[PDB]
Amino acid sequence: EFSMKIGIIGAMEEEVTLLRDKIENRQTISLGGCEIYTGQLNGTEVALLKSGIGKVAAALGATLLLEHCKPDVIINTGSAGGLAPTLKVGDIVVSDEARYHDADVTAFGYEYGQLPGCPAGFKADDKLIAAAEACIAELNLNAVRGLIVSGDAFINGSVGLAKIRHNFPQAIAVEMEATAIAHVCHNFNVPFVVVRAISNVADQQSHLSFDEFLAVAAKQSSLMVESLVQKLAHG
Amino acid sequence: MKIGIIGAMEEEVTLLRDKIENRQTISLGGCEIYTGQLNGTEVALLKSGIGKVAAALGATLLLEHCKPDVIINTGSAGGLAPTLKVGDIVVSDEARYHDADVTAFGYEYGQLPGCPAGFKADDKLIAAAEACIAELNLNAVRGLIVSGDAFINGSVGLAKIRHNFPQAIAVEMEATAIAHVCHNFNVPFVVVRAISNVADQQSHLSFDEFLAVAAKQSSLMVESLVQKLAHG
Ligand SMILES: CSC[C@H]1O[C@@H](n2cnc3c(N)ncnc32)[C@H](O)[C@@H]1O
Ligand SMILES: CSC[C@H]1O[C@@H](n2cnc3c(N)ncnc32)[C@H](O)[C@@H]1O
Numbered sequence: 001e002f003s004m005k006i007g008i009i010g011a012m013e014e015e016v017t018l019l020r021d022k023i024e025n026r027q028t029i030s031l032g033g034c035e036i037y038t039g040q041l042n043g044t045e046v047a048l049l050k051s052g053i054g055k056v057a058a059a060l061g062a063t064l065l066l067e068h069c070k071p072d073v074i075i076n077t078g079s080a081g082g083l084a085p086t087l088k089v090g091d092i093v094v095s096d097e098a099r100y101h102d103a104d105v106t107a108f109g110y111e112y113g114q115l116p117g118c119p120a121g122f123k124a125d126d127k128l129i130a131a132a133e134a135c136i137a138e139l140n141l142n143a144v145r146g147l148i149v150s151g152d153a154f155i156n157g158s159v160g161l162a163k164i165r166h167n168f169p170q171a172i173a174v175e176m177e178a179t180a181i182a183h184v185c186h187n188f189n190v191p192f193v194v195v196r197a198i199s200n201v202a203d204q205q206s207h208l209s210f211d212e213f214l215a216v217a218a219k220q221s222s223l224m225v226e227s228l229v230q231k232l233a234h235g
Numbered sequence: 236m237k238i239g240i241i242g243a244m245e246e247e248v249t250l251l252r253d254k255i256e257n258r259q260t261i262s263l264g265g266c267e268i269y270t271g272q273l274n275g276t277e278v279a280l281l282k283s284g285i286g287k288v289a290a291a292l293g294a295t296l297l298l299e300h301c302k303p304d305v306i307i308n309t310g311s312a313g314g315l316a317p318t319l320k321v322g323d324i325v326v327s328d329e330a331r332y333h334d335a336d337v338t339a340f341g342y343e344y345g346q347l348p349g350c351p352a353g354f355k356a357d358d359k360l361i362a363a364a365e366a367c368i369a370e371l372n373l374n375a376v377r378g379l380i381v382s383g384d385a386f387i388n389g390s391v392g393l394a395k396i397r398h399n400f401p402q403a404i405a406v407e408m409e410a411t412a413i414a415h416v417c418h419n420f421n422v423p424f425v426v427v428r429a430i431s432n433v434a435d436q437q438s439h440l441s442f443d444e445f446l447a448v449a450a451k452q453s454s455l456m457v458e459s460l461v462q463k464l465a466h467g
Binding site: 032033034052053054055056057059060062063064067100102103104105106107108115116117118151152153154156179180183184187188206207 | 264265266284285286287288289291292295296299332334335336337339340347348349350383384385386388392411412415416419420438439
């Protein structure tokens with residue numbers, strides 16, 4: 001397809017810089033505190049947004065990206081804290097869906113993590129997921145697919161981590177933007193998929209590990225997005 | 236001037252929607268915005284839905300599609316200040332996320348990277364609110380309002396908020412996301428909400444009993460505030 005535009009969202013400069021550097025005929029849109037780089041990745045039109053950290057920042061950015069750029073699909077990239085036992089720093093996690101691990105209106109009968117007016121979780125697009133898995137296989141990378149949960153806190157072991165494992169025993173990774181992006185996408189009916197890499201395991205060593213392994217995570221997730229954009233656009 | 240107003244629930248915005256004349260409706264991103272005049276003042280009323288993301292998406296659409304000069308966030312809230320009773324008013328001096336924590340990276344508790352630790356509400360909007368409160372003989376408290384994506388009802392939830400923000404006068408779920416979006420677009424804002432519960436273990440029961448009263452009181456304050464801002 002020669003008419004599609006793939007949207008990509010990363011929260012930090014370290015997470016979008018590799019991709020930004022590969023954009024052909026790049027230009028930059030500066031709006032509401034966010035930056036969006038337009039151009040093409042090996043011929044495929046893309047709109048890469050640096051959203052900032054956290055749920056609100058990502059929502060605000062995701063909304064602007066959809067409104068000003070109208071991408072057909074959205075891919076959220078960057079690093080995450082690994083929760084699945086087989087995950088090691090560098091490994092890829094693909095979202096089957098996204099849920100807020102810090103949303104709680106259970107007092108009114110909603111299931112934990114669900115906000116009023118929203119489904120309890122947001123489902124990633126089946127085709128995007130299948131495409132991401134193909135890339136994972138073609139690149140011979142270790143990955144895990146499943147539930148990714150977001151919140152506005154950096155998980156670093158202790159109660160923060162345990163509470164999450166307890167409410168979401170099946171969660172494979174934790175971060176701070178995916179569910180806000182999926183929430184916005186859901187409201188606009190835009191297909192999305194989260195493809196991040198592991199930089200820590202959200203335990204008490206998470207900050208030490210994050211600082212040490214963010215670059216390798218950025219590299220691996222960036223490689224995956226580059227490969228995914230190509231696959232989604234031409235097969 | 237065009238005054239932006241944001242409420243989360245139908246119950247919080249319905250009284251106001253009923254008063255908007257030359258009324259039109261914008262439906263987008265799962266949100267509804269009612270435009271027109273309120274007692275002779277141009278307004279844009281957004282029903283955002285509950286939570287930070289819904290409020291952030293809503294506020295972003297409102298600014299971009301309606302470009303109001305200022306924003307007023309209304310609705311009910313859980314009172315934390317000792318002198319608040321159900322129905323009373325809380326006015327924001329400032330808004331802070333009570334559930335944001337990146338302190339592992341040196342940011343202040345509640346502060347997200349790239350943002351000020353707190354979002355200061357507009358002095359003139361605050362002054363005007365305080366004027367209406369005095370003119371209406373209402374009981375109110377002004378100060379820090381904290382937002383999170385959890386309904387607070389005693390226990391650990393309430394204890395953690397008391398620990399990090401002992402000066403918080405109220406707690407709710409949209410104010411700071413709205414302040415955060417307004418910050419990014421240089422738009423003045425203020426929070427004027429009415430109490431429906433005191434965020435203790437009986438907060439769900441109080442909420443259900445008093446949301447109607449809180450919606451009414453908050454709606455009246457907004458109506459008076461809008462009129463004062465546009466006509467003295
Ligand atoms: C510096 S704040 C952490 C940033 O990296 C992601 N992240 C990586 N590991 C973690 C973790 N263990 N807890 C929370 N967010 C994480 C988040 O989405 C946010 O953009
Ligand atoms: C049904 S979820 C509660 C809704 O009312 C407000 N609210 C009122 N009291 C409280 C409370 N005690 N804790 C959290 N949000 C509250 C929130 O902003 C949200 O829109």
